[PDB]
């Protein structure tokens, strides 16, 4: 999922 993928997590911070 989005958490453990780079790109995802930095525009995700808050969410990870």
Known sequence: ???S???CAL???DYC
Request: charged fraction near 0%; glycine fraction near 12%.
């Open 1 to 3: 999922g989005c958490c």
């Open 5 to 7: 993928l780079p790109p």
């Open 11 to 13: 525009s995700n911070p």
